[PDB]
Design a protein around this motif. Structure first.
Motif, PDB file in Angstrom:
ATOM      1  N   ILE A 161       0.833  -1.196   0.000  1.00 55.80           N
ATOM      2  CA  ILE A 161       0.000   0.000   0.000  1.00 55.80           C
ATOM      3  C   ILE A 161       0.872   1.252   0.000  1.00 55.80           C
ATOM      4  O   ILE A 161       0.391   2.364  -0.215  1.00 55.80           O
ATOM      5  N   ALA A 162       2.164   1.057   0.237  1.00 58.79           N
ATOM      6  CA  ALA A 162       3.113   2.163   0.255  1.00 58.79           C
ATOM      7  C   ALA A 162       3.500   2.584  -1.156  1.00 58.79           C
ATOM      8  O   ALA A 162       3.609   3.769  -1.448  1.00 58.79           O
ATOM      9  N   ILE A 163       3.692   1.605  -2.035  1.00 57.31           N
ATOM     10  CA  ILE A 163       4.059   1.895  -3.417  1.00 57.31           C
ATOM     11  C   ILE A 163       2.826   2.247  -4.245  1.00 57.31           C
ATOM     12  O   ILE A 163       2.929   2.879  -5.301  1.00 57.31           O
ATOM     13  N   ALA A 164       1.658   1.835  -3.762  1.00 62.77           N
ATOM     14  CA  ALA A 164       0.410   2.103  -4.463  1.00 62.77           C
ATOM     15  C   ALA A 164       0.057   3.586  -4.427  1.00 62.77           C
ATOM     16  O   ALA A 164      -0.497   4.121  -5.381  1.00 62.77           O
ATOM     17  N   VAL A 165       0.400   4.243  -3.324  1.00 61.01           N
ATOM     18  CA  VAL A 165       0.023   5.633  -3.081  1.00 61.01           C
ATOM     19  C   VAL A 165       0.440   6.567  -4.217  1.00 61.01           C
ATOM     20  O   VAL A 165      -0.224   7.566  -4.482  1.00 61.01           O
ATOM     21  N   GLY A 166       1.547   6.243  -4.877  1.00 63.40           N
ATOM     22  CA  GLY A 166       2.069   7.074  -5.945  1.00 63.40           C
ATOM     23  C   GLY A 166       1.285   6.940  -7.233  1.00 63.40           C
ATOM     24  O   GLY A 166       1.466   7.730  -8.165  1.00 63.40           O
ATOM     25  N   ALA A 167       0.407   5.944  -7.291  1.00 64.02           N
ATOM     26  CA  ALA A 167      -0.370   5.693  -8.501  1.00 64.02           C
ATOM     27  C   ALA A 167      -1.857   5.998  -8.324  1.00 64.02           C
ATOM     28  O   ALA A 167      -2.542   6.360  -9.280  1.00 64.02           O
ATOM     29  N   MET A 168      -2.357   5.860  -7.101  1.00 65.85           N
ATOM     30  CA  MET A 168      -3.753   6.170  -6.818  1.00 65.85           C
ATOM     31  C   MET A 168      -4.028   7.643  -7.096  1.00 65.85           C
ATOM     32  O   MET A 168      -5.123   8.008  -7.523  1.00 65.85           O
ATOM     33  N   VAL A 169      -3.030   8.481  -6.840  1.00 70.58           N
ATOM     34  CA  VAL A 169      -3.152   9.914  -7.069  1.00 70.58           C
ATOM     35  C   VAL A 169      -2.852  10.245  -8.526  1.00 70.58           C
ATOM     36  O   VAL A 169      -3.393  11.204  -9.079  1.00 70.58           O
ATOM     37  N   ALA A 170      -1.985   9.448  -9.143  1.00 67.50           N
ATOM     38  CA  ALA A 170      -1.666   9.627 -10.554  1.00 67.50           C
ATOM     39  C   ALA A 170      -2.890   9.309 -11.402  1.00 67.50           C
ATOM     40  O   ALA A 170      -3.028   9.798 -12.521  1.00 67.50           O
ATOM     41  N   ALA A 171      -3.775   8.485 -10.852  1.00 68.12           N
ATOM     42  CA  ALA A 171      -5.024   8.144 -11.510  1.00 68.12           C
ATOM     43  C   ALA A 171      -5.901   9.381 -11.639  1.00 68.12           C
ATOM     44  O   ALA A 171      -6.421   9.682 -12.713  1.00 68.12           O
ATOM     45  N   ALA A 172      -6.052  10.099 -10.532  1.00 65.90           N
ATOM     46  CA  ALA A 172      -6.946  11.251 -10.473  1.00 65.90           C
ATOM     47  C   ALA A 172      -6.459  12.438 -11.302  1.00 65.90           C
ATOM     48  O   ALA A 172      -7.170  12.915 -12.187  1.00 65.90           O
ATOM     49  N   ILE A 173      -5.246  12.905 -11.019  1.00 66.72           N
ATOM     50  CA  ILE A 173      -4.743  14.145 -11.612  1.00 66.72           C
ATOM     51  C   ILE A 173      -4.754  14.163 -13.141  1.00 66.72           C
ATOM     52  O   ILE A 173      -5.094  15.179 -13.746  1.00 66.72           O
ATOM     53  N   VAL A 174      -4.379  13.050 -13.765  1.00 71.05           N
ATOM     54  CA  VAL A 174      -4.327  12.984 -15.223  1.00 71.05           C
ATOM     55  C   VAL A 174      -5.718  13.179 -15.825  1.00 71.05           C
ATOM     56  O   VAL A 174      -5.861  13.480 -17.011  1.00 71.05           O
ATOM     57  N   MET A 175      -6.740  13.014 -14.991  1.00 68.84           N
ATOM     58  CA  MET A 175      -8.117  13.258 -15.396  1.00 68.84           C
ATOM     59  C   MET A 175      -8.498  14.702 -15.092  1.00 68.84           C
ATOM     60  O   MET A 175      -9.191  15.354 -15.875  1.00 68.84           O
ATOM     61  N   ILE A 176      -8.046  15.190 -13.942  1.00 69.53           N
ATOM     62  CA  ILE A 176      -8.275  16.572 -13.544  1.00 69.53           C
ATOM     63  C   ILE A 176      -7.576  17.533 -14.497  1.00 69.53           C
ATOM     64  O   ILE A 176      -8.072  18.626 -14.772  1.00 69.53           O
ATOM     65  N   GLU A 177      -6.426  17.110 -15.009  1.00 74.71           N
ATOM     66  CA  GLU A 177      -5.599  17.962 -15.852  1.00 74.71           C
ATOM     67  C   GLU A 177      -6.234  18.210 -17.218  1.00 74.71           C
ATOM     68  O   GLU A 177      -6.367  19.355 -17.650  1.00 74.71           O
ATOM     69  N   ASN A 178      -6.621  17.136 -17.900  1.00 75.90           N
ATOM     70  CA  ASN A 178      -7.268  17.259 -19.202  1.00 75.90           C
ATOM     71  C   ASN A 178      -8.628  17.936 -19.079  1.00 75.90           C
ATOM     72  O   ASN A 178      -9.316  18.164 -20.073  1.00 75.90           O
ATOM     73  N   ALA A 179      -9.006  18.257 -17.845  1.00 74.39           N
ATOM     74  CA  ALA A 179     -10.251  18.961 -17.573  1.00 74.39           C
ATOM     75  C   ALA A 179      -9.974  20.427 -17.246  1.00 74.39           C
ATOM     76  O   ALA A 179     -10.877  21.262 -17.285  1.00 74.39           O
ATOM     77  N   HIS A 180      -8.721  20.728 -16.922  1.00 80.21           N
ATOM     78  CA  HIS A 180      -8.298  22.099 -16.661  1.00 80.21           C
ATOM     79  C   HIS A 180      -8.055  22.847 -17.966  1.00 80.21           C
ATOM     80  O   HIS A 180      -8.198  24.069 -18.028  1.00 80.21           O
ATOM     81  N   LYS A 181      -7.680  22.108 -19.004  1.00 78.60           N
ATOM     82  CA  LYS A 181      -7.475  22.700 -20.321  1.00 78.60           C
ATOM     83  C   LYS A 181      -8.720  22.521 -21.191  1.00 78.60           C
ATOM     84  O   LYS A 181      -8.813  23.075 -22.286  1.00 78.60           O
ATOM     85  N   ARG A 182      -9.676  21.743 -20.693  1.00 77.49           N
ATOM     86  CA  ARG A 182     -10.979  21.644 -21.338  1.00 77.49           C
ATOM     87  C   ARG A 182     -11.855  22.785 -20.841  1.00 77.49           C
ATOM     88  O   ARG A 182     -12.757  23.248 -21.542  1.00 77.49           O
ATOM     89  N   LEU A 183     -11.577  23.236 -19.621  1.00 80.60           N
ATOM     90  CA  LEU A 183     -12.241  24.406 -19.060  1.00 80.60           C
ATOM     91  C   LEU A 183     -11.393  25.651 -19.280  1.00 80.60           C
ATOM     92  O   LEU A 183     -11.387  26.570 -18.461  1.00 80.60           O
ATOM     93  N   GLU A 184     -10.671  25.664 -20.395  1.00 79.62           N
ATOM     94  CA  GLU A 184      -9.861  26.810 -20.781  1.00 79.62           C
ATOM     95  C   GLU A 184     -10.077  27.065 -22.266  1.00 79.62           C
ATOM     96  O   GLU A 184      -9.457  27.947 -22.856  1.00 79.62           O
ATOM     97  N   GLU A 185     -10.963  26.272 -22.864  1.00 84.52           N
ATOM     98  CA  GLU A 185     -11.315  26.424 -24.270  1.00 84.52           C
ATOM     99  C   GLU A 185     -12.784  26.810 -24.418  1.00 84.52           C
ATOM    100  O   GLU A 185     -13.143  27.590 -25.298  1.00 84.52           O
ATOM    101  N   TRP A 186     -13.631  26.257 -23.555  1.00 89.58           N
ATOM    102  CA  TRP A 186     -15.037  26.638 -23.517  1.00 89.58           C
ATOM    103  C   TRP A 186     -15.143  28.000 -22.842  1.00 89.58           C
ATOM    104  O   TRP A 186     -16.231  28.551 -22.680  1.00 89.58           O
ATOM    105  N   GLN A 187     -13.990  28.529 -22.448  1.00 90.80           N
ATOM    106  CA  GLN A 187     -13.902  29.854 -21.853  1.00 90.80           C
ATOM    107  C   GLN A 187     -13.298  30.833 -22.857  1.00 90.80           C
ATOM    108  O   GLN A 187     -13.411  32.050 -22.702  1.00 90.80           O
TER     109      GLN A 187
END
Lengths: 139, 44, 96
Positions: free
Chosen positions: A1-27
């Protein structure tokens, strides 16, 4: 569960990121002072359109490209067995969470000076790209 | 198939939210009451 | 680097050849990655880094099972930014 922590968060951000530049074009294509709860609903759930499969299957890769370890027999297997187990469950957690909870929680809630150093060497790679598949092979 | 599964969950949202909430409180009870040891038993 | 050659700059390529147009569709699949990328390699190494410091009960085995990952996650990213692209630009020219 120690090595997993670095990927559980990598799961989220890569989705949040492509949504930060998706909310920069409809703007930049629409006004700026007019947006509803549905006008914001559509933009983030349209970043999950592309990267959606890309990650749930890449964390499906992380979890399956590890299965072979369970074939460890005897002493060493009893050791790293439990490690493989937890690493996997914790990934299947963040993975099957980034498809039920992550997209929602992000909807209910100096990058310049690295881009400057990368692309001079990126375009340089596009010089005779076959020569950089040669330097790589030397690595 | 993944996209459709994203859409269905977004639709669920607020029934899903409370499931992940009840999981978080449940995943807090089990942990507290989890046995412990230095290593897994390795002996034959 | 696939959905960059599947957007609207990918109407130009399939129809006719334009190196300075697939290089523009590659320069964007390059500044659009630098943000998700540098942070993926960040959260991976940053969260994988603490266990590399092996002091305490049980550290020994963890620092050994982490070093390969931490180290492998320096050349895996760094290098892939130059191998994958300059090889997809080379494979898109064969079938063409």
């Amino acid at each position: 569960i120690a090595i997993a922590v670095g990927a559980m968060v990598a799961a989220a951000i890569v989705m949040i990121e492509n949504a930060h530049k998706r909310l920069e074009e409809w703007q930049h294509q629409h006004p700026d002072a007019t947006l509803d709860n549905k006008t914001r609903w559509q933009v983030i759930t349209d970043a999950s359109v592309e990267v959606g499969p890309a990650l749930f299957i890449s964390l499906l890769i992380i979890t399956l490209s590890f299965i072979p370890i369970f074939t460890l027999e005897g002493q060493e297997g009893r050791l790293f067995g439990p490690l493989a187990f937890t690493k996997t469950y914790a990934m299947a957690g963040a993975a099957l969470l980034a498809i039920v909870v992550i997209p929602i929680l992000m909807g209910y809630w100096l990058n310049r000076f690295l881009i400057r150093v990368y692309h001079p060497l990126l375009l340089k790679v596009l010089h005779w790209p076959k020569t950089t598949l040669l330097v790589a092979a030397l690595s | 198939m993944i996209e459709w599964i994203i859409r269905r969950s977004v639709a669920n949202r607020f029934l899903v939210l409370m499931g992940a909430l009840f999981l978080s409180i449940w995943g807090t009870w089990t942990i507290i009451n989890t046995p412990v040891d230095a290593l897994p038993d390795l002996s034959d | 680097l696939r959905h960059a050659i599947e957007a609207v700059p990918s109407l130009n390529n399939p129809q006719t050849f334009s190196e300075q147009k697939l290089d523009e569709a590659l320069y964007h699949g390059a500044v659009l990655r630098v943000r998700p990328k540098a942070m993926t390699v960040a959260v991976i190494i940053a969260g994988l880094l603490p266990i590399l410091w092996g002091t305490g009960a049980g550290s020994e085995v963890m620092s050994r099972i982490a070093a390969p990952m931490i180290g492998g996650m320096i050349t895996a990213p760094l290098l892939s930014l130059f191998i994958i692209p300059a090889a997809y630009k080379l494979m898109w020219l064969h079938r063409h």
